[PDB]
Amino acid sequence: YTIWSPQDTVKDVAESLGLENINDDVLKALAMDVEYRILEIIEQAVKFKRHSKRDVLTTDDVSKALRVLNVEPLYGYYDGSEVNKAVSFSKVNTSGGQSVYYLDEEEVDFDRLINEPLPQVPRLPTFTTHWLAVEGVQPAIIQNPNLNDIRVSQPPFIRGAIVTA
Amino acid sequence: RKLRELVKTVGIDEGDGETVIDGDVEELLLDLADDFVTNVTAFSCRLAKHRKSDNLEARDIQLHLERNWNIRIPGYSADEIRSTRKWNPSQNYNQKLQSITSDKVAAA
Amino acid sequence: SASDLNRIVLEYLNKKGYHRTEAMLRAESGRTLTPQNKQSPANTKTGKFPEQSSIPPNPGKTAKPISNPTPENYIRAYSMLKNWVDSSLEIYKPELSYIMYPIFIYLFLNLVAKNPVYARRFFDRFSPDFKDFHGSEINRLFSVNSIDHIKENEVASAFQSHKYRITMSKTTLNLLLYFLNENESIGGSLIISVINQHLDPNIDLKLEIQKVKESRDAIKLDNLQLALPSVCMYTFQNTNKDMSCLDFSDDCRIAAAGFQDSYIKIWSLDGSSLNNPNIALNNNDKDEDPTCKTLVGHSGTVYSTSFSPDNKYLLSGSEDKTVRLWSMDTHTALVSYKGHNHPVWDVSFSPLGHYFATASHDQTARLWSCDHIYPLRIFAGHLNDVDCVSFHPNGCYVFTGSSDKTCRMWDVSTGDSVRLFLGHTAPVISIAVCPDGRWLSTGSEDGIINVWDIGTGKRLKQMRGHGKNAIYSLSYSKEGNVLISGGADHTVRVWDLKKATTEPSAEPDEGDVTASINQDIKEYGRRRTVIPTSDLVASFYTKKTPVFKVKFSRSNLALAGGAFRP
Amino acid sequence: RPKRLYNFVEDADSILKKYEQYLHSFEFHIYENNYKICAPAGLILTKNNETLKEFLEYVARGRIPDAIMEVLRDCNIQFYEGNLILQVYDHTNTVDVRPRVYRTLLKPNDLTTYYDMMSYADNARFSDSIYQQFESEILTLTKRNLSLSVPLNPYEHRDMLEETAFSEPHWDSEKKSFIHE
Amino acid sequence: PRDVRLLHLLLASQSIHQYEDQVPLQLMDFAHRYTQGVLKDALVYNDYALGVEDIRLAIAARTQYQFKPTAPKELMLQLAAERNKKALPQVMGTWGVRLPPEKYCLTAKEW
Amino acid sequence: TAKVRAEICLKRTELQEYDISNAIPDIVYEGVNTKTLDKMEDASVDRMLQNGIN
């Protein structure tokens, strides 16, 4: 196999068509190719993430690996108050011999969507400059770090080796 | 000189103007057609081999142009190509939809 | 499996037609390092400008890097001295105001004998400044345009016989000689020859210039020592993670930042007007100018942006499949450049501003020109897409790094790859070649910089101080080799390029406490920590803003730039 | 530090001048209204066709066509530092006592290296990184003669230079004007 | 869900430790549509002549127009060689940036 | 300052404004980071000051 699904995901789409019983070689090769296509989306997604100068993989980083790979667009993954990780993975289990998760969603009226006030908008961008170093040492203004709380904040694979002049 | 006849039957005057073609566009569209021919018959040969035969019949080409490009040529062998499944789900799938609808009504 | 590769190489040379002695000598040429060129950035004594001959570049008529060693018209050679004496209202001003006339007269009289139209340029270029000081003599010198015209003007014919006398002090004569010795090949030697052969200085002259050159040779700096730079950091505040890579201009007056919502934002870094008012000043103070202009011509997200060395034009590459050109003095778009079918990721001008190279998702780099709408060369041969692009500082090779853990050097004329550099383990994201030109440096997304030499093509050494993360930008010291790397781990690091090589670069003669104990704490674990190379010397952290850009200015001051992230 | 002084040629004329007084690689003949491509020693003779009218576009541009690489390896001809020497005989302008002999050189491309690797892939069965390392080693050993030396940059030494060696925009009456074409 | 945390392990297997929440949801809703289309076209190709070569025909039918093409380096090398026949044009020698002719620039246009 | 300057001039032959190493230069323009907040607050109070018009 590989790590996508032996039958537990691909076969529940095979039954969604109507196809009753198919061999496990079909599901093995089919799920291998499906998660190869998933990795093929993921690699263009991390390329767009790197060239967008970011560290998370947002939903608009995989939605631009779709237009590049000509995939029909997955609409409906961007809503109001677009924050980083707008938490929406409330998927609800349903019992049986196996597990089924169905992503419950609450219906809403229209007149509480038109009579709803507008959010806050921040300021337009500005800049602010200071001295990071004057001769190779850091002048320890409020805008500089402390170089001892850099230990207790980040591990040395996302902050690198601390050496000073 | 055939492509000028093809643009002639596409672009006629018809009381609103005639559109003509230029030579670089003719070389471009002739290369497009030249690659289209091989791209149709190379998958049609795979379909005719998938049908466990040796001849290249017209049902392979009509199936390959119906499913993928949807050109929809009228009947050459287009009664065997037209396969009619209803795409209704299985009995496990409607069971799981009953479970999902039961949880969606038991939540309220 | 490398000895089998050596055998495959030897059989390839044997079947592709290299004699045994010839293949042995090409192997020995391939193994040895590129030696030192002492005129490495072309120092202004023995170095020349590039020719402006209206032809495109060509890397031919050129010997190998393995072998050991390595007309100038009168108007620029006079304008050098003119601006040098014009930049001073000091105590030595009117003596230069005295001596500026006969050098101009003798250059004009020595240039009418060779090129008449250059002489007609040279006379009327510097005419109306001392007409009130020297009378109608320049009106008498209107009618000289040929060799036989010199025999008409009796004072011009007398200027060959009558050597022009000038009584000059010792400090002014030594100032002029030590100014015109410090840059010979601009035209200082051409001024010195006219001074020696046509003037009469009151106080032999060849022995004086010999003493000048010998005393100037007696005190220089042979082997340079390192210097730690001062970094000025530009932190952008209200960008809600929608600011891509930015760039600063040269003179550092304009900053350009590409947004995820298809704008280019233009900041005056001095707080200036940035409205270019052009004293007429018609109307429209009713608008709001926050010393910042927005440029709306793209329909996709701007992923790169590059400034011309002229600094009057901007080049923005987007994810809509165009590269657009903007005028930095009327704030509009000028030209759209359509040659890609995938998003554009790295645009970069030439050194001389002639023609720009482009990187895109379609695994090919493209060479352009600012007057042609469509490309000129296609650089194909990478396995994955091209991330970064950069020229050699002469504008004659192209360097492209790509996401298949490699980079390439391309001939700009024939188009085909000349070098392929292997050894990385991650997408190469920023590349930069030293002002010497013999060494290439690049950084990957594994936090490892490494340097190769372009002659051998193999690795001199690497650099292992950044976190296991991206190295966004890269910059070089102007004179010498000190690498400044601004990456994604919020640090700007400083690297000595000349530690483990055959060039040690003048280490100090005589200890520390903080050295070799900072990464000997290792609280997180030995295998879960980074261990820096002996090349890393300093690292300035930025406190929760990452650095998109490092730009080393001319005077040992680098600038970093990035966005305040939360 | 280099050990000797090396003399390597990476032009067309210099490689040809080095490799005169040597036996040629091809042997092409221009007869009247028909041609012949033989070996230096059943060799075919062609009518005016379109494969030859595209091969002739690869000898006025002195490069080997990408198609021939494997079969050159099959036909045991002599290469000369990756190049092969086409000796053309124009029999229409012969002299009496021998036809008009030309001796041109054809140069390898990136396509010729790629097709040589694709034809190496028949009986070798290597991976991709072996082809990467092989191409890097051969691009090292066969591409000498690099112009890596930097001149003065004219944009920093602006004060010691003529004023109209640069072209910036200027402001005219109520508009401004760039330089075009 | 089992495939949300399996996608967590897949993303972490390729060193992707920061992402949003709806990204495995988007990957699952891609994989559902892709497998459903592939199995529907394979049911058509099995009614024509299930098995693995049927799946191969159904995923070779749609490889040809959407995802990243395979070994495109030799076609790009041929195309580059067709573009790199032409020698480079004559450049300006006045050390600046030269524009195209005025009709080929975005200035002589009207709304 | 009569005690510290004697020690400094005796040290060189081997508040304050001639300690050479510990000096930071000045920038031609730095951006606003705090003044614009109170500027927006008393501008909002000014929009309250204009007799109740939104």
Query: Residue C299: how many CA atoms within 13 Å on its side-chain side?
Result: 4
Given CA atoms C476, C481, C482, C487 in this order, what sign does their dihedral have? positive
| Nearest-angstrom CA–CA distance, A2 and A36 | 10
Residues 393-412 of C with CB under 8 A from E: 412
Q: A108 with C203: CB under 8 angstroms?
A: no
Show the 3-state SS of chain F: CCCHHHHHHHHHCCCCCCCCCCCCCCCCCCCCCCHHHHHHHHHHHHHHHCCCCC
CA dihedral C432, C438, C444, C446 (to 10 degrees): -140
Cβ-Cβ pairs closer than 8 A, C with F, add up to 9
Q: How many domains does chain B have?
A: 1
| Nearest-angstrom CA–CA distance, C256 and C331 | 12
What are C431's strand-pairing partners? C442
Q: A122 with C452: CB under 8 angstroms?
A: no
Do F31 and C237 count as a contact with CB atoms less than 8 A apart? yes
| Nearest-angstrom CA–CA distance, A82 and E21 | 13
Cα–chain center distance at B16: 32
**C187 in the Ramachandran plot: left (φ > 0), alpha (ψ -120 to 50) or beta?**
left
Interior angle at CA A119, CA A115 and CA A122, nearest 5: 160
Question: Which chain F residues touch A126 with a CB distance below 8 Å?
Answer: 31-32, 36
Q: What SS3 class is residue D167?
A: strand
The residue type at C359 = A
> Nearest chain E Cα to A28, which residue?
E52
Do E95 and D154 count as a contact with CB atoms less than 8 A apart? yes
- Spatial neighbors of C488 by CB under 8 A, at least 6 apart, are A55, C467, C469, C470, C471, C472, C546
Cα–chain center distance at C238: 33
| Nearest-angstrom CA–CA distance, A84 and C90 | 61
Q: Which phi and psi angles does C305 have, rounded to 5°? A: -165, 135
Q: What SS3 class is residue C246?
A: strand
Q: C417 with D139: CB under 8 angstroms?
A: yes
The first and second tokens of residue C214, run together, are: 């010998």
Do C237 and F29 count as a contact with CB atoms less than 8 A apart? no
Residue found under tokens 């007696």: C218
The count of other CB atoms within 10 Å of the CB of residue D87 is: 16
The first and second tokens of residue C480, run together, are: 């010498």
| Nearest-angstrom CA–CA distance, D181 and C195 | 43
| Nearest-angstrom CA–CA distance, A154 and E27 | 30
Name the nearest CA neighbour of C385 among C415, C344, C348: C344
Question: Which chain E residues touch A31 with a CB distance below 8 Å?
Answer: 35
Question: Which chain C residues touch D145 with a CB distance below 8 Å?
Answer: 59-60, 62-64
Residues 7-46 of B with CB under 8 A from E: 39, 43, 46
Do E94 and D167 count as a contact with CB atoms less than 8 A apart? yes
Quick one: chain C helix, strand, coil %, rounded to 5? 20, 30, 50
The residue type at C185 = S
Do A30 and E39 count as a contact with CB atoms less than 8 A apart? yes
The alpha-carbon gap from E75 to the nearest alpha carbon of chain C, in Å, equals: 10
Compute and round to an integer the Cα radius of gyration of chain C: 28
Chains that touch D (3 or more CB pairs under 8 A): C, E
| Nearest-angstrom CA–CA distance, C431 and A38 | 30
Q: E93 with D179: CB under 8 angstroms?
A: no
Cα–chain center distance at C361: 27
Interface test with F, best of A126, A132, A144 (most F CBs within 10 A): A126
Q: What SS3 class is residue E53?
A: helix
Sequence ranges of the domains in chain E: 1-111
Q: CA separation (Å) from C506 to C227, C461, C499, E28?
A: 12, 19, 10, 60
Q: What is the DSSP letter of C216?
A: H
Residue found under tokens 């030192």: C36
| Nearest-angstrom CA–CA distance, C106 and C165 | 13
The alpha-carbon gap from F9 to the nearest alpha carbon of chain A, in Å, equals: 24
The first and second tokens of residue A159, run together, are: 């902050």
Q: CA separation (Å) from E73 to C317, C364, D110, E3?
A: 24, 9, 11, 35
| Nearest-angstrom CA–CA distance, A114 and B7 | 52
The length of chain C, given as a count of residues: 566
Residue found under tokens 């292997």: C422
- Can you state the angle between helices C93-111 and C74-86, rounded to 10 degrees? 170
Burial class (CB in 10 A: 0-12, 13-18, 19+), C52: middle
Q: C92 with C174: CB under 8 angstroms?
A: no
Q: C202 with A88: CB under 8 angstroms?
A: no
Question: Which chain D residues touch C180 with a CB distance below 8 Å?
Answer: none
The count of other CB atoms within 10 Å of the CB of residue C264 is: 24
| Nearest-angstrom CA–CA distance, D121 and E74 | 14
Nearest to A131 among F24, F29, F33 (CB): F24
Across C301-453, the runs of DSSP E, i.e. the strands, are 302-307, 313-318, 323-327, 332-337, 344-348, 357-360, 364-369, 372-380, 386-391, 397-402, 406-411, 417-422, 428-433, 439-444, 449-453
Report yes or no: D149 at the C interface, CB cutoff 8 Å.
yes
The first and second tokens of residue D24, run together, are: 């040629």
| Nearest-angstrom CA–CA distance, D129 and D138 | 14
| Nearest-angstrom CA–CA distance, C557 and A129 | 14
| Nearest-angstrom CA–CA distance, A54 and C244 | 9
Across C209-260, the runs of DSSP E, i.e. the strands, are 230-236, 243-248, 254-259
- Spatial neighbors of C252 by CB under 8 A, at least 6 apart, are C269, C551, C553, C559
Do C230 and A126 count as a contact with CB atoms less than 8 A apart? no
The alpha-carbon gap from C155 to the nearest alpha carbon of chain F, in Å, equals: 54
Question: Which chain F residues touch A128 with a CB distance below 8 Å?
Answer: 30-33
- Can you state the angle between helices E22-48 and E2-13, rounded to 10 degrees? 100
| Nearest-angstrom CA–CA distance, C215 and C206 | 14
> Nearest chain E Cα to C372, which residue?
E100
The first and second tokens of residue C18, run together, are: 């290299």
The residue type at C489 = D
The enclosing H or E element of B40 equals helix B23-50
Name the nearest CA neighbour of C52 among D179, D161, E102: D161
What are C228's strand-pairing partners? none
Cα–chain center distance at C319: 28
Question: Which chain C residues touch F31 with a CB distance below 8 Å?
Answer: 237
| Nearest-angstrom CA–CA distance, C106 and C123 | 11
Do B50 and E53 count as a contact with CB atoms less than 8 A apart? yes
Q: CA separation (Å) from C155 to C132, C145, C159, C164?
A: 19, 15, 6, 11
Name the nearest CA neighbour of A52 among C531, C429, D56: C429
Question: Which chain B residues touch A96 with a CB distance below 8 Å?
Answer: 96, 99
Question: Which chain D residues touch E85 with a CB distance below 8 Å?
Answer: 61
DSSP string covering D51-119: HHHHHGGGTTTTB--GGGHHHHHHTTPPPBTTBEEEEEEESTT------EEEEEEEB--HHHHHHHHHH
Q: Which phi and psi angles does C440 have, rounded to 5°? A: -110, 135
| Nearest-angstrom CA–CA distance, C476 and C482 | 6
| Nearest-angstrom CA–CA distance, C557 and C343 | 34
Q: What is the DSSP letter of E96?
A: B
Chain F and chain B touch, per 3+ beta carbon pairs within 8 A: no
| Nearest-angstrom CA–CA distance, C244 and C565 | 12
The residue type at B91 = Q
Report yes or no: B1 at the E interface, CB cutoff 8 Å.
no
Nearest to A102 among B85, B88, B103 (CB): B103
| Nearest-angstrom CA–CA distance, F21 and D116 | 63
Show the 3-state SS of C44-84: CCCCCCCCCCCCCCCCCCCCCCCCCCCCCCHHHHHHHHHHH
The length of chain A, given as a count of residues: 165
| Nearest-angstrom CA–CA distance, C310 and B83 | 67
The first and second tokens of residue A136, run together, are: 């190779």
Nearest to A38 among E16, E21, E27 (CB): E27
> Nearest chain C Cα to D63, which residue?
C414
| Nearest-angstrom CA–CA distance, A83 and C327 | 35
Report yes or no: A9 at the E interface, CB cutoff 8 Å.
yes
The length of chain D, given as a count of residues: 181
Cβ-Cβ pairs closer than 8 A, A with E, add up to 129
Q: CA separation (Å) from E61 to A18, A160, B63, C462?
A: 22, 48, 12, 46
| Nearest-angstrom CA–CA distance, C160 and F23 | 59
The count of other CB atoms within 10 Å of the CB of residue A94 is: 16
What are E10's strand-pairing partners? none
Burial class (CB in 10 A: 0-12, 13-18, 19+), B33: exposed
Residues 93-152 of C with CB under 8 A from E: none
Do B47 and E60 count as a contact with CB atoms less than 8 A apart? no
**C264 in the Ramachandran plot: left (φ > 0), alpha (ψ -120 to 50) or beta?**
beta
Do A126 and F30 count as a contact with CB atoms less than 8 A apart? no
| Nearest-angstrom CA–CA distance, D108 and D66 | 9
The residue type at C542 = T
Report yes or no: E6 at the A interface, CB cutoff 8 Å.
yes
Residue found under tokens 């200036």: C272
Any alpha helices (H) in C58-188, and if so which ranges?
A: 74-86, 93-111, 116-125, 131-134, 137-140, 147-150, 154-161, 170-180
Q: What SS3 class is residue C406?
A: strand
Report yes or no: D143 at the C interface, CB cutoff 8 Å.
yes
Nearest to E99 among D110, D164, D179 (CB): D179
> Nearest chain A Cα to B107, which residue?
A104
| Nearest-angstrom CA–CA distance, A137 and A43 | 39
Report yes or no: D133 at the C interface, CB cutoff 8 Å.
yes
The alpha-carbon gap from A163 to the nearest alpha carbon of chain F, in Å, equals: 20
Q: C476 with C438: CB under 8 angstroms?
A: no
Do D141 and C330 count as a contact with CB atoms less than 8 A apart? no
Contacts 24+ apart (CB under 8 A), C38-41: C38/C70, C39/C70, C39/D149, C40/C435, C40/C436, C40/C437, C40/C438, C40/D150, C41/C435, C41/C436, C41/C479, C41/D150
Question: Which chain A residues touch E8 with a CB distance below 8 Å?
Answer: none
Residue B3: give the domain boundaries. Answer: 1-108
The first and second tokens of residue C506, run together, are: 């003048």
Name the nearest CA neighbour of C414 among D154, E80, A90: E80
The count of other CB atoms within 10 Å of the CB of residue C405 is: 20
Nearest to F29 among C230, C237, C271 (CB): C271
The first and second tokens of residue C420, run together, are: 């392929």
The alpha-carbon gap from E78 to the nearest alpha carbon of chain C, in Å, equals: 9
